[PDB]
């Protein structure tokens, strides 16, 4: 497998026996999540289960709107 | 480190191009229709590129089908704590994806498991248009694949949230690679500042590629899995195969080996794959130690090496290093330190990014200046001085001035 | 890269000062009383500074009001699985904040959504004492605002857990900015080590500011949103406006342009905003490729440029680069490479941090040494040798020595 | 919008047309979470709901004490 | 920054060695049997090393005992929403650990709270074989301990998932430490490129250790808790105690102080522990400002210092710095800038990694060349020219050539 | 406590008064999680509680298998 040689003249060492895996290109894939367009959160419900559902739906709505607000800024790394 | 000689690429240029293509009219509708009866399909975009497409989560189906059939006759109170928990489980992945993109400005790396789970990534690898060798390599090293991947958020429209995952393509596989470790090579004088030092600057990873050698100076961007080395060519320099000649003979004329020069003699160690290089200078106490025997070697001044068999610890000054315990065979190649060959008087001692030939040229120039001055100084000695200024003529008899009156 | 010329600041010095102020007597009580009927109020501290204050979570109210009215007559068994889930939801944010500060020693950056949600951050921006232009800019670029913010944990006392969020102030807005890309410029010789090379070292971001130019050498600390550039002045150098003269004429005397010199001719590419710079040297194969046409240009040795229109890929050796597909107009400005003007014999080839004038001065010194030696060598030739040492006097007839006896 | 010029003489390029947003100052805001001082976890309850509440309250107590132990080390970045 | 002189270690070499030992036959069975009646026990491995072992989570017991007694007579429908939540709570820690190792290729740093909670880490510290002083130090600075720790995943077999947590050992404690801040020291000329500059390159942390000084050039790898400094010796250089002589006298011969030279005069500031160093050059406007008084000092060209008492802000050009408000006493030590002593004509102005002696040697060589040329030039003037070539003999009367016929 | 001296001649400053804590060694501890070997997910149950248990058990199984697949790659940092 792996072997190593030390050169005293130049104070250096070389470790041989490795195999390559070089990133030479890029493959791009599109990952999608299907979303639901909801507007009517109307519910005259005081049940705690109803309140939990309302909280989780608000979280979903906030996530979607936050992603949209991110989308109004085009992607760029620097 | 030769990292300043590297180029400047654009990592997510290809992914951003796919995002821009996805914003064209009808592109999102094409993807939505394609992902109607399946979670995975191949879609040809308007620019002629065929890209794999995944639907990893369907919140539209779970909210409209299950949930939201609550008969809101002022009540809406149709619920079961199970579907509350189930909705939290489904919605959490969207929340985590939104969290990650919020703190990374829409581009993330490595691709997290929320962005792409292991099963989805393995399925993606299986259907990629690559060799079975490349599929096997990516599947066996999923964690490295994640580390060399970007997730770029494209678009959220038409009830579709889409982001591109930009995966690596390993077009060079199973070619031999080797790693070069370098340590400073000074003279062994005990006094401070009275030493000349030299160091090879070409340390890093080397791999054979298309009849050349791809050289990765910043070895911290290369990930090693046992005997395999994963490297990015965007962080590489392409060199002729003769760069390996610097390991058999640093003075070979077929390749100009890279070195740097200094007058600072400082002790340090370099932990290699199967051993340790120790550069001991001045009055530093450098030792090699064993966990069951204690100190078993005391290094002398200069550059030395010890293998990992029988040695578990190297101490250089107040710094203690653990050596790697990887199995393998080590070989010591004896030779005279090349720093002995250099005259310190004409030695260029601040060559930060230099080479063997460049240092030799500067030494030649300094010696040429010395010879030129000596030749002028010697030629001047062959001339004659001024005869005494005393109002009487003088003649040159042998090497001195004698009065003309003596010969009249 | 000119990053070593940058100063050293203290990023959270202002925030730590507010933390120390918060530890004074009565400061926490002032904040607690101010945040009694509202989640957001302005508080004047003991040092005269008015700071916005948020109450983002009230665990005291949720634990003492809801929960904890369980009639612990040996039972305490008053519970509903809803309030168990609700308490987990409320308590989770505290747990995540504690997790983040545990792994970051009380200082975090970027400010996570757990530390400050989008709605809270937008509300904070709305009430900051800044221009409506600055409010609009921060609101539209919340993700960048998070990236340029710190969260410092101050105090936990008097039933109050307080941390300061240190937000950026963009005092310079909408001034023109430009980016400078540089690539090595060597001679085109095929042999190795037989080349002289030069490179502009002033690459980075430049922005007009208060009649000067703020220069950011490490362009990786600047975030670009479409046409907008977000930069930190703590990572900037202030330069006169004449630094732009290096782009119209590198030999102008009004500003001393920064360059570095080398003898290593290595091929690389630099991906610019609208194109790619290709530095091809030696026998490297450099090509520009199209996704629908293949290789459409083969670069010759030297430095060349190609725009992104019609080109999707540049390959330099074994390194493949994707060019940015951003829309814009590119212009090629023809000119003779300045490296042609330099004589390699007297060329200073290891100037790591140098300038046009400094290189010219060193060339002048080397030529002055050559001229001085030649003048001495020429003046020596005007003198006369020694007459033969043979015991008889000699006289100077024309340019040679003749016996005095001939003229007696 | 964005324009770019390449100078062949100096092997350099300039991309113009960008707009600035420079961080010139710092604004500091105080974010607070109101906490509850609880000591009596006394409950002779074996109900599973009670055990879950006890676990979540212990998590809260551990978080508060861990933050206090962090506070015994004054903030400093280096 | 002297970071290029540092060595190269292997951070997790010791931990990887323990992982390899754990793969030997019977090692996992030994650990499993040892952790039968307790969550914490000391185990001696096959190589003679005794290691503390923790069982932090027992999913085997929770799944086989509670849960999985569901009488699957086609039903399996034995369940309570409590045990569903409880299983989610227990299983979540495993999921988070799996997530972290998936994105970090099995090695993580800092050790997260999921990998080791505070109570487990404190218990681990309590039972470590170290001094009570070291136990007290680690317990009081748990967040720093996490930051200086690695988590390496070893093995998953025999119903056991095992990873090693590699904790720091602070063998040097309570020795005095000091920090050195350096700023460029140019001449104060208003023109550009007409200045010679010098800068001390030995900035960083210094700590007394075993009669030597451990020097940490990259001070960003050292974490400061009030008056305590946490540093890694693997990122250190060992120096003689005489390195402190560079602070009392930079020209001392007992230690060769490290400097760099340049001709670029650029204004910057360095924020120190108790003040700010201001390097003002050219026409830059450098001011020290107070939050209640405004600008209270305008710096002149050169290098100056101001303490943090009475000063809250230093502005250099378009860059604004907040000074640290830490309490302490500052002292200004007056002296003439050493750059005044250097003649710009023979000043080596591109010494990137140099020293006081090395710069003095180069100046000596340049002056020696000047003196050697002048001595040759002066000695040549003592010789005699050629007599006129006109066919008649000439004799040397006083300092000129007169016809021989005049004296016959 | 902390004192600082500025040297005008060399344009440098020294801050004294700090105390050391230097990492000189490594101590390695083994952290274990006991796992359950399960194969029979057989259950003819449509109850939602049963489905939730099945989902959480699949998550556990996926985590274990993913860790095993990680283990087929020996640890190494670079």
UniProtKB/TrEMBL annotation, chains B, C, E:
Recorded superkingdom: Viruses
Compartments where found: Host Golgi apparatus membrane; Host cell membrane; Virion membrane
Membrane topology listed for this record: Single-pass membrane protein; Single-pass type I membrane protein
Keywords: Cleavage on pair of basic residues, Coiled coil, Disulfide bond, Fusion of virus membrane with host cell membrane, Fusion of virus membrane with host membrane, Glycoprotein, Host cell membrane, Host Golgi apparatus, Host membrane, Host-virus interaction, Lipoprotein, Membrane, Palmitate, Signal, Syncytium formation induced by viral infection, Transmembrane, Transmembrane helix, Viral attachment to host cell, Viral attachment to host entry receptor, Viral envelope protein, Viral penetration into host cytoplasm, Virion, Virus entry into host cell
GO biological process terms held by the UniProt record: entry receptor-mediated virion attachment to host cell; fusion of virus membrane with host plasma membrane; symbiont entry into host cell; symbiont-mediated induction of syncytium formation
GO cellular component: host cell Golgi membrane; host cell plasma membrane; viral envelope; virion membrane
Disulfide-bonded cysteines: 177-207, 186-197, 222-231, 246-257, 280-286
Quaternary structure (record): Homotrimer. Heterodimer with fusion protein F2; disulfide-linked. Interacts with host NCL; this interaction plays a role in viral entry into the host cell. As a heterodimer with F2, interacts with host heparan sulfate. As a heterodimer with F2, interacts with host IGF1R; this interaction activates PRKCZ/PKCzeta that recruits NCL/nucleolin from the host nucleus to the plasma membrane. Part of a complex composed of F1, F2 and G glycoproteins. As a heterodimer with F2, interacts with host RHOA; this interaction facilitates virus-induced syncytium formation.
Described function: Inactive precursor that is cleaved at two sites by a furin-like protease to give rise to the mature F1 and F2 fusion glycoproteins. Major determinant of the species specificity of RSV infection. The trimer of F1-F2 (F protein) also facilitates the attachment to host cell by binding to host heparan sulfate. F protein is involved in the entry into the host cell through the interaction with host IGF1R. This interaction activates PRKCZ/PKCzeta that recruits host NCL/nucleolin to the apical cell surface where it can bind fusion glycoprotein F1.
Family (UniProt): Belongs to the paramyxoviruses fusion glycoprotein family.
Protein name per its UniProtKB record: Fusion glycoprotein F0
Organism this protein belongs to: Human respiratory syncytial virus MinFLC
Residues shown, of full length: 137 to 513 of 574
């Amino acid at each position: 497998n792996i072997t190593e040689e030390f050169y005293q003249s130049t104070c250096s060492a070389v470790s041989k026996g490795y195999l390559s895996a070089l990133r030479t290109g890029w493959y791009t894939s599109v990952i999608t999540i299907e979303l639901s367009n909801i507007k009517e959160n109307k519910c005259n419900g005081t049940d705690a289960k109803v309140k939990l559902i309302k909280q989780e739906l608000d979280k979903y709505k906030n996530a979607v709107t936050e992603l949209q607000l991110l989308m109004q800024s085009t992607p760029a790394t620097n | 480190f030769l990292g300043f000689l590297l180029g400047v690429g654009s990592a997510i240029a290809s992914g951003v191009a796919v995002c821009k293509v996805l914003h064209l009219e009808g592109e999102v509708n094409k993807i939505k229709s394609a992902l109607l009866s399946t979670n995975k399909a191949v879609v040809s975009l308007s620019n002629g590129v065929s890209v794999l497409t995944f639907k990893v989560l369907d919140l539209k189906n779970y909210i409209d089908k299950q949930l939201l059939p609550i008969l809101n006759k002022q009540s809406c109170s149709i619920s079961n704590i199970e579907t509350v928990i189930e909705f939290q489980q489904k919605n959490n992945r969207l929340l985590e994806i939104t969290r990650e993109f919020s703190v990374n400005a829409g581009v993330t790396t490595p691709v997290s498991t929320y962005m792409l789970t292991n099963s989805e990534l393995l399925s993606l690898i299986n259907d990629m248009p690559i060799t079975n060798d490349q599929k096997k390599l990516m599947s066996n090293n999923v964690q490295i694949v994640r580390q060399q991947s970007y997730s770029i958020m494209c678009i959220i429209k038409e009830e579709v949230l889409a982001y591109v995952v930009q995966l690596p393509l390993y077009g060079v596989i199973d070619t031999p690679c080797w790693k070069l470790h370098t340590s400073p090579l000074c003279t062994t004088n005990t006094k401070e500042g009275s030493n000349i030092c030299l160091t090879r600057t070409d340390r890093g990873w080397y791999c054979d590629n298309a009849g050349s050698v791809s050289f990765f100076p910043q070895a911290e961007t290369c990930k090693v899995q046992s005997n395999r080395v994963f490297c990015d060519t965007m962080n590489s320099l392409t060199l002729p195969s003769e760069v390996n000649l610097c390991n058999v003979d640093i003075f070979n004329p077929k390749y100009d080996c890279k070195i740097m020069t200094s007058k600072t003699d400082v002790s340090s160690s370099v932990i290699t794959s199967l051993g340790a290089i120790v550069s001991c200078y001045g009055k530093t106490k450098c030792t090699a130690s064993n966990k069951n025997r204690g100190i078993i070697k005391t290094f002398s001044n200069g550059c030395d090496y010890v293998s990992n068999k029988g040695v578990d610890t190297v101490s250089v000054g107040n710094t203690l290093y653990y050596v790697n315990k990887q199995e393998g065979k080590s070989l010591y190649v004896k030779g005279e330190p090349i720093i002995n060959f250099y005259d310190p008087l004409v030695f260029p001692s601040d060559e930060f990014d230099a080479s063997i030939s460049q240092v030799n040229e500067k030494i030649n120039q300094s010696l040429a200046f010395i010879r030129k001055s000596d030749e002028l100084l010697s030629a001047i000695g062959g001339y004659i001085p001024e005869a005494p200024r005393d109002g009487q003529a003088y003649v040159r008899k042998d090497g001195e001035w004698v009065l003309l009156s003596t010969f009249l």
